[PDB]
Write a protein that holds these residues in place. Structure first.
Motif, PDB file in Angstrom:
ATOM      1  N   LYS A  95       0.845  -1.179   0.000  1.00  0.00           N
ATOM      2  CA  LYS A  95       0.000   0.000   0.000  1.00  0.00           C
ATOM      3  C   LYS A  95       0.885   1.235   0.000  1.00  0.00           C
ATOM      4  O   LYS A  95       1.824   1.337   0.796  1.00  0.00           O
ATOM      5  N   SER A 139      -4.627  16.111   1.111  1.00  0.00           N
ATOM      6  CA  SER A 139      -5.489  14.952   1.028  1.00  0.00           C
ATOM      7  C   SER A 139      -4.656  13.745   0.623  1.00  0.00           C
ATOM      8  O   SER A 139      -3.543  13.878   0.116  1.00  0.00           O
ATOM      9  N   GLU A 140      -5.208  12.559   0.847  1.00  0.00           N
ATOM     10  CA  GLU A 140      -4.510  11.316   0.576  1.00  0.00           C
ATOM     11  C   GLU A 140      -5.409  10.367  -0.191  1.00  0.00           C
ATOM     12  O   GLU A 140      -6.599  10.257   0.105  1.00  0.00           O
ATOM     13  N   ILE A 141      -4.847   9.689  -1.186  1.00  0.00           N
ATOM     14  CA  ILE A 141      -5.461   8.504  -1.779  1.00  0.00           C
ATOM     15  C   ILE A 141      -4.427   7.386  -1.673  1.00  0.00           C
ATOM     16  O   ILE A 141      -3.252   7.597  -1.987  1.00  0.00           O
ATOM     17  N   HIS A 142      -4.840   6.230  -1.180  1.00  0.00           N
ATOM     18  CA  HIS A 142      -3.943   5.102  -1.030  1.00  0.00           C
ATOM     19  C   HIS A 142      -4.161   4.117  -2.166  1.00  0.00           C
ATOM     20  O   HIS A 142      -5.279   3.937  -2.657  1.00  0.00           O
ATOM     21  N   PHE A 143      -3.076   3.469  -2.575  1.00  0.00           N
ATOM     22  CA  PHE A 143      -3.121   2.507  -3.669  1.00  0.00           C
ATOM     23  C   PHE A 143      -2.487   1.206  -3.230  1.00  0.00           C
ATOM     24  O   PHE A 143      -1.373   1.207  -2.710  1.00  0.00           O
ATOM     25  N   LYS A 144      -3.171   0.100  -3.466  1.00  0.00           N
ATOM     26  CA  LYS A 144      -2.559  -1.211  -3.324  1.00  0.00           C
ATOM     27  C   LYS A 144      -2.022  -1.627  -4.688  1.00  0.00           C
ATOM     28  O   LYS A 144      -2.780  -1.680  -5.665  1.00  0.00           O
ATOM     29  N   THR A 201       4.169  -3.714 -10.532  1.00  0.00           N
ATOM     30  CA  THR A 201       3.255  -2.847 -11.258  1.00  0.00           C
ATOM     31  C   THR A 201       3.997  -1.648 -11.827  1.00  0.00           C
ATOM     32  O   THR A 201       4.823  -1.033 -11.146  1.00  0.00           O
ATOM     33  N   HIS A 202       3.701  -1.312 -13.081  1.00  0.00           N
ATOM     34  CA  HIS A 202       4.202  -0.071 -13.659  1.00  0.00           C
ATOM     35  C   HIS A 202       3.428   1.113 -13.095  1.00  0.00           C
ATOM     36  O   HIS A 202       2.201   1.152 -13.155  1.00  0.00           O
ATOM     37  N   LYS A 207       0.159   3.282 -13.921  1.00  0.00           N
ATOM     38  CA  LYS A 207      -1.221   2.973 -13.553  1.00  0.00           C
ATOM     39  C   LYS A 207      -1.668   3.769 -12.333  1.00  0.00           C
ATOM     40  O   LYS A 207      -2.824   4.195 -12.256  1.00  0.00           O
ATOM     41  N   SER A 264      -4.579   6.703 -12.446  1.00  0.00           N
ATOM     42  CA  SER A 264      -5.729   6.579 -11.560  1.00  0.00           C
ATOM     43  C   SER A 264      -5.855   7.806 -10.676  1.00  0.00           C
ATOM     44  O   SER A 264      -6.946   8.371 -10.532  1.00  0.00           O
ATOM     45  N   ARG A 282      -8.951  10.565 -10.646  1.00  0.00           N
ATOM     46  CA  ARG A 282      -9.740  10.848  -9.450  1.00  0.00           C
ATOM     47  C   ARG A 282      -9.715  12.333  -9.093  1.00  0.00           C
ATOM     48  O   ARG A 282     -10.680  12.852  -8.516  1.00  0.00           O
TER      49      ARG A 282
END
Lengths: 76, 9
Positions: A4, A13-18, A23-24, A27, A31, A35
């Protein structure tokens, strides 16, 4: 295998990515920009202050669980 | 904001 990552914007603000270690990161950039409703090429994504390229992977960059990516406006 | 986690790949 998956980690993560926390993506921190200019407004804190924060957006978390798994993501997979393989992974390149294009992506994640696409994303996040989607958003936020901004063009992907209007942003630069930094890890430890260094620019993340479309073909960089977490494994290549040495990223670990809960590492931070910062987002800035592209330079001019 | 609420927590937001997006899975990729």
């Amino acid at each position: 295998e998956y980690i993560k990552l926390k993506v921190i914007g200019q407004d804190s603000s924060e957006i978390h990515f798994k993501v997979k270690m393989t992974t390149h990161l294009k992506k994640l950039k696409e994303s996040y920009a989607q958003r936020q409703g901004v063009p992907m090429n209007s942003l630069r994504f930094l890890f430890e202050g260094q620019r993340i390229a479309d073909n960089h992977t977490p494994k290549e960059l040495g990223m670990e669980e809960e590492d931070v990516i910062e987002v800035y406006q592209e330079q001019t | 904001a609420e927590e937001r986690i997006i899975s990729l790949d």
